[PDB]
Design a protein around this ligand. Structure first.
Ligand SMILES: [Mg+2]
Ligand SMILES: [Mg+2]
Ligand SMILES: [Mg+2]
Ligand SMILES: [Mg+2]
Ligand SMILES: [Mg+2]
Ligand SMILES: [Mg+2]
Ligand SMILES: [Mg+2]
Ligand SMILES: [Mg+2]
Ligand SMILES: [Mg+2]
Ligand SMILES: [Mg+2]
Ligand SMILES: [Mg+2]
Ligand SMILES: [Mg+2]
Ligand SMILES: [Mg+2]
Ligand SMILES: [Mg+2]
Ligand SMILES: [Mg+2]
Ligand SMILES: [Mg+2]
Ligand SMILES: [Mg+2]
Ligand SMILES: [Mg+2]
Ligand SMILES: [Mg+2]
Ligand SMILES: [Mg+2]
Ligand SMILES: [Mg+2]
Ligand SMILES: [Mg+2]
Ligand SMILES: [Mg+2]
Ligand SMILES: [Mg+2]
Ligand SMILES: [Mg+2]
Ligand SMILES: [Mg+2]
Ligand SMILES: [Mg+2]
Ligand SMILES: [Mg+2]
Ligand SMILES: [Mg+2]
Ligand SMILES: [Mg+2]
Ligand SMILES: [Mg+2]
Ligand SMILES: [Mg+2]
Ligand SMILES: [Mg+2]
Ligand SMILES: [Mg+2]
Ligand SMILES: [Mg+2]
Ligand SMILES: [Mg+2]
Ligand SMILES: [Mg+2]
Ligand SMILES: [Mg+2]
Ligand SMILES: [Mg+2]
Ligand SMILES: [Mg+2]
Ligand SMILES: [Mg+2]
Ligand SMILES: [Mg+2]
Ligand SMILES: [Mg+2]
Ligand SMILES: [Mg+2]
Ligand SMILES: [Mg+2]
Ligand SMILES: [Mg+2]
Ligand SMILES: [Mg+2]
Ligand SMILES: [Mg+2]
Ligand SMILES: [Mg+2]
Ligand SMILES: [Mg+2]
Ligand SMILES: [Mg+2]
Ligand SMILES: [Mg+2]
Ligand SMILES: [Mg+2]
Ligand SMILES: [Mg+2]
Ligand SMILES: [Mg+2]
Ligand SMILES: [Mg+2]
Ligand SMILES: [Mg+2]
Ligand SMILES: [Zn+2]
Lengths: 144, 81, 87, 150, 129, 155
RNA sequence: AGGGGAUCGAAGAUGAUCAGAUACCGUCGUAGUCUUAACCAUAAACUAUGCCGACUAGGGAUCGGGUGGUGUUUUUUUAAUGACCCACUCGGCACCUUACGAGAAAUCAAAGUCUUUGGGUUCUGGGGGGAGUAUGGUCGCAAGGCUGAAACUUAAAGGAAUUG
RNA sequence: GCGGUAAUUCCAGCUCCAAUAGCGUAUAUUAAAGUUGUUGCAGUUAAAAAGCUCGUAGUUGAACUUUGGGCCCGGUUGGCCGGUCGGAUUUCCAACGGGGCCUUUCCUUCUGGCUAACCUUGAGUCCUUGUGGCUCUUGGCGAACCAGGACUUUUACUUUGAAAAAAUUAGAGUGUUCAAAGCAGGCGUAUUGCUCGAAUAUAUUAGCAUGGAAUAAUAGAAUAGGACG
RNA sequence: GGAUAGUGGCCUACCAUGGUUUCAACGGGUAACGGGGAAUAAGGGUUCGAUUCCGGAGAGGGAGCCUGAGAAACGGCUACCA
């Protein structure tokens, strides 16, 4: 009866064996090791607000050919440096260095999105006023 | 095959099987009385000997053992029971 | 396979092997029906009158269709000797 | 099937259905018991005695004509040895294997056969010791076993 | 080494039915085997069986028809708790209308509907449809 | 446990409030007190015939047995007048629907009215805190020795 | 660490070859190859297939044991022996044909009796890289062995079969 | 995967789709996932059997010991009638369960207290030709359990039951106008009150308490230091 | 024996060498208060519970104590540290 002990008093062996093999599950390991809190630029939190250091033009990967307009950002709770994408046509016009941006994840559990190499985040707000509203023109950036 | 009498197997194809693989297992060995005319009385012997059996009085022989049944010695007789 | 009150519902009560009693289902185009003719006085095989036997595909593939026919027909009076029940 | 090899061979006595009889067997319980004890006096083992009785005499099974196993007959008349005989012959063997290995330290095969024998010794001895026929704390050991068997 | 004698007899019965046989020599037979084979026969999944007495543990020659799909043994005799006879039969029975899960209770080896009317329970032995 | 000496302490060993008047000439020297614990546990003769003191005796001491009554098998008899017993039991794990062998070792005071040995099964009554760890007292020896003399010499 | 050191021959030196040729081929030939006393513990250490038990199908060979014979050949005076022939049965190493059945298939008498899912038990695996790497513990004279992660990266990597 | 000049994925206009006082995004987690597999995975070639054998902890472990027959007692569904003024119970009947008996058959055990039950019978009879029926004390039931003494092989499993907060869940009742809720409310003489409620279920593992005696263990009598008196 | 409202190595004196552990002691982690409970609806499960009820703990960190039936209290005192 391949493998597992079938008997009626081997619940100890079965429990332990499960414990051990949960560790081969990449998300159990992450949750138990605390990777969230230990690695990762966010705290494990959903978002994180940082400061714009410089404006980058990341060249996209194959078989695409573009320049991917990003920003290096230094997280306020970490000082950790993080290169983040500025989505939508324009928008890199909206940032400028030293501004205060709200970075969010990319929706890939870590992992960089499409062809933007090694960018695991995206800009959601600048100066407290959100890209989307600025792009459409519902809002306007604050004074300074 | 497909349907057969497992309870009443023919003593022909039962005689052929292994002593343990019969319907109710039993031995295939037998005993026999043996004589050597120098004496007048007989000795009871098992067909598979191990011990090279000697007669009642005369230090003679009877059978030397083997891988199975014993080899009774030269001029001897034997009724079976 | 009746229903609530009486009424035999559900079509098609399939055949059945006389040797195994396993169902003979539709797509078994390897099962068989052997009609055996009832004779009468002095030869004469009486058309339209049979002792019939159904044999499932499994048995015929296994090579048990001959031996099982013998047993079936003999204990049905149209054979004597031939088959032994012991072995 | 076989503990210390992979051999699977079935092979045994096929004991008869007839738990009594042979009917053709005359003699008496008296007779064979006295035969058992006289051979036990001669120093034979219950195995040895059963075989000798089974061929040279007419004793199909010593337990049928006397409702008693040979070892109990030897025990009752106060003839049981110190250790059982299967444990004896195992220890005896381990002794001879070891003696051969003291002489030929280059025979790694013998070392491997010594382990198997000794492990068999120890598990058997543990059984006997559970069922109180060996004094609880009875243990095999090479230094004392050579002295034990002889 | 032989671990469940119930298992061997049952499986052997199953290989027989599948191989299109009508009879089967099982070894080595026991009270628990008799009572499983007796509930199997109480509902006609087998015909009559026969205990042959070797002077050892026994042998059984089961005569079987062919209304048997499968008869299995639940290898750890799990303890069933009057509510759980529900979930067991649910797990391994082709329908509610038929099939039996047979188990051991302190009111005897009995199928689940018997055990339900008698309103007793215990450990689970096997099943048969 | 104990054995010998009786009077083997810096303090005089006496039963409290059990006066034996020296004016009254007695043919038993010391007057002894005893009781029965209840729950049908016979106060064995070794407790009434005895001469020991043990104020933690349930039969000749100042302790009442009440609450739990449990049984275990004696695994340690090295502490003076107290033992340690193992209590095995199977724990039920749902998810797997089977059990697993567990155990706990209860420390329990043992009156010198009992001669206890490792291996014996003992029946033990709950009582007030006797020591840092002892919450139980031996109230019945349901064993003997386990065929100890039946391991004697040869014929 | 001794011995041994014929043969072949990691290293190295050469002759040729080549654009190059630290190779392939030729020559010389150190270590080794052999043995003793110790280490080392790894191989595609392979049947790439845990062990014990049950059950499920036909066949001719063959190795060991055994049983049966008014079988053959061995001559002598018939035997006894021995080898040989036929039938059987155990336990082997294998092949053949089947395929009820299994598989993703190649194939498989188990890799079968598995969604109609439970005989007992041991071990391992959880996408690919990162990597058998880093770190600690341990073993070794050493080379190394055992134990053995993570950050990050990535949409395939992979298997069997078909057609080109 | 789209975009390098007719872009069905970009920027827009048009039209169109889905959800709609809401809809998108990020992080987590649950389902899908039989990708953690007790149920329920896989490990020849895809990830994966330790080079091999011993072996302790652990898990597992062949069969066998009261089975069979006979008798009584009373239940709860279901039929065929209903007798009746929708439900009723007796006989006819099966079906399915419960209790106690006799078969060689401890039920712990003495010593009374107690008796409900017939081997009784003491009378006869209501009434269908009579074992259809119970009142009814004078030889003759133990166990139904009191209480005192004397002792007892250990467990696992299952059954039922007690002890069991509320809110939560499941769920009955009630027309918050519906609904989420709430535990209200509903009737008249609405001039001097009448009244239904505020259920039931789960509540497990451990401990307690009772019934079971299959399946699993455990103990016993072999240097008899055995059992009854 | 002292101490306590009181049992107790709670504490002290003398005496012993014991106690726990692969059925995982001891140690480490916890982005750990525990429970009633919550989310996920074939089942078996998985995940969660700082948070309306119950229990515990704290009142910047420690210790100490007065009053009192009850506090080692902090919208009490006392000392140190911050
Ligand atoms: Mg791994
Ligand atoms: Mg990864
Ligand atoms: Mg940079
Ligand atoms: Mg075998
Ligand atoms: Mg083994
Ligand atoms: Mg043999
Ligand atoms: Mg004391
Ligand atoms: Mg001590
Ligand atoms: Mg103590
Ligand atoms: Mg050389
Ligand atoms: Mg070179
Ligand atoms: Mg060159
Ligand atoms: Mg070179
Ligand atoms: Mg060269
Ligand atoms: Mg390797
Ligand atoms: Mg190979
Ligand atoms: Mg391998
Ligand atoms: Mg074959
Ligand atoms: Mg021959
Ligand atoms: Mg097949
Ligand atoms: Mg094919
Ligand atoms: Mg992986
Ligand atoms: Mg290191
Ligand atoms: Mg060295
Ligand atoms: Mg190293
Ligand atoms: Mg490793
Ligand atoms: Mg390392
Ligand atoms: Mg791509
Ligand atoms: Mg266009
Ligand atoms: Mg699109
Ligand atoms: Mg458009
Ligand atoms: Mg939605
Ligand atoms: Mg599912
Ligand atoms: Mg996975
Ligand atoms: Mg289960
Ligand atoms: Mg399922
Ligand atoms: Mg998988
Ligand atoms: Mg592989
Ligand atoms: Mg291997
Ligand atoms: Mg190992
Ligand atoms: Mg068993
Ligand atoms: Mg009966
Ligand atoms: Mg009854
Ligand atoms: Mg309950
Ligand atoms: Mg105190
Ligand atoms: Mg010490
Ligand atoms: Mg110690
Ligand atoms: Mg552990
Ligand atoms: Mg915390
Ligand atoms: Mg928590
Ligand atoms: Mg909480
Ligand atoms: Mg918190
Ligand atoms: Mg409390
Ligand atoms: Mg604060
Ligand atoms: Mg304070
Ligand atoms: Mg306050
Ligand atoms: Mg500080
Ligand atoms: Zn002679």
């Amino acid at each position: 009866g391949k493998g597992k002990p079938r008997g009626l008093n081997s619940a100890r062996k079965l429990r332990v064996h499960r414990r051990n093999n949960r560790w081969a599950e990449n998300n159990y390991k992450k949750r138990l090791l605390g990777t969230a809190f230990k690695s990762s630029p966010f705290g494990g939190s959903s978002h994180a607000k940082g400061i714009v250091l410089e404006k980058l033009g990341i060249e996209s990967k194959q078989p695409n050919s573009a320049i991917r307009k990003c920003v290096r950002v230094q997280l306020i709770k970490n000082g950790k440096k993080v290169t983040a994408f500025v989505p939508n046509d324009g928008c890199l016009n909206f940032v400028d260095e030293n501004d205060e941006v709200l970075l969010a994840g990319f929706g890939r559990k870590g992992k960089a999105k499409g062809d933007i190499p090694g960018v695991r985040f995206k800009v959601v707000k600048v100066s407290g006023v959100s890209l989307l509203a600025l792009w459409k023109e519902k809002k306007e950036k604050p004074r300074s | 095959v497909l349907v057969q009498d497992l309870l009443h197997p023919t003593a022909a194809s039962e005689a052929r099987k292994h002593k343990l693989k019969t319907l109710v297992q039993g031995p295939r060995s037998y005993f026999l009385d043996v004589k050597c005319p120098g004496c007048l009385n007989i000795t009871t012997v098992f067909s598979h000997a191990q011990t090279a059996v000697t007669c009642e009085s005369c230090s003679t022989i009877l059978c030397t053992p083997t891988g199975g049944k014993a080899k009774l010695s030269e001029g001897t007789s034997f009724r079976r029971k | 396979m009746e229903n609530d009150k009486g009424q035999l519902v559900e079509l098609y009560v399939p055949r059945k092997c006389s040797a195994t009693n396993r169902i003979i289902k539709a797509d078994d185009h390897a099962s068989v029906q052997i009609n055996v003719a009832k004779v009468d006085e002095e030869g004469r095989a009486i058309p339209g009158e049979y002792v019939t036997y159904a044999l499932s595909g499994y048995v015929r593939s296994r090579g048990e269709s001959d031996d099982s026919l013998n047993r079936l027909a003999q204990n049905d009076g149209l054979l004597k000797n031939v088959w032994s029940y012991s072995r | 099937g076989r503990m210390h090899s992979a051999g699977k061979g079935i092979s045994s006595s096929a004991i008869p259905y007839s738990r009594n009889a042979p009917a053709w067997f005359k003699l008496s319980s008296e007779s064979v018991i006295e035969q058992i004890v006289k051979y036990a006096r001669k120093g034979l083992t219950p195995s040895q005695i059963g075989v000798l009785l089974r061929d040279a005499h007419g004793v199909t099974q010593a337990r049928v004509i006397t409702g008693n196993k040979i070892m109990r007959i030897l025990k009752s008349n106060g003839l049981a040895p110190e250790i059982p005989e299967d444990l004896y012959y195992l220890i005896k063997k381990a002794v001879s294997v070891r003696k051969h290995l003291e002489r030929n330290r280059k025979d790694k095969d013998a070392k491997f056969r010594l382990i198997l024998i000794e492990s068999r010794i120890h598990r058997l001895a543990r059984y006997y010791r559970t069922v109180a026929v060996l004094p609880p704390n009875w243990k095999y050991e090479s230094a004392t076993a050579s002295a034990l068997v002889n | 080494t032989r671990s469940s004698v119930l298992a061997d007899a049952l499986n052997a019965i199953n290989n027989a039915e599948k191989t299109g046989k009508r009879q089967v020599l099982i070894r080595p037979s026991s009270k628990v085997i008799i009572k499983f084979l007796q509930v199997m026969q109480k509902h006609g999944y087998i015909g009559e069986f026969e205990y042959i007495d070797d002077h050892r543990s026994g042998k059984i020659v089961v005569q079987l028809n062919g209304r048997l799909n499968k008869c299995g043994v639940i290898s750890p005799r799990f303890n069933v708790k009057i509510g759980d006879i529900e979930k067991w039969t649910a797990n391994l029975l082709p329908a509610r209308q038929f099939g039996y899960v047979i188990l051991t209770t302190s009111a005897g080896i009995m199928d689940h509907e018997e055990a339900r009317r008698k309103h007793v329970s215990g450990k689970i032995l096997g099943f048969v449809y | 446990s104990t054995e010998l000496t009786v009077q083997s302490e810096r303090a005089f060993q006496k039963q409290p409030h059990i006066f034996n008047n020296p004016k009254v000439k007695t043919s038993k020297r010391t007057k002894r007190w005893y009781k029965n614990a209840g729950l049908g546990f016979k106060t064995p003769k070794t407790a009434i015939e005895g001469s020991y003191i043990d104020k933690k005796c349930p039969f000749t001491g100042l302790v009442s047995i009440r609450g739990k009554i449990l049984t275990g098998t004696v695994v340690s008899t090295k502490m003076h007048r107290t033992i340690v017993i193992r209590r095995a039991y199977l724990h039920y794990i749902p998810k797997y629907n089977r059990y697993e062998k567990r155990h706990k070792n209860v420390p329990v005071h043992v009156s010198p009215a009992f001669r206890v040995q490792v291996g014996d099964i003992v029946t033990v009554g709950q009582c007030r805190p006797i020591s840092k760890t002892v919450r139980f007292n031996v109230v019945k020896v349901s064993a003997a020795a386990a065929x100890x003399x039946x391991x004697x010499x040869x014929x």
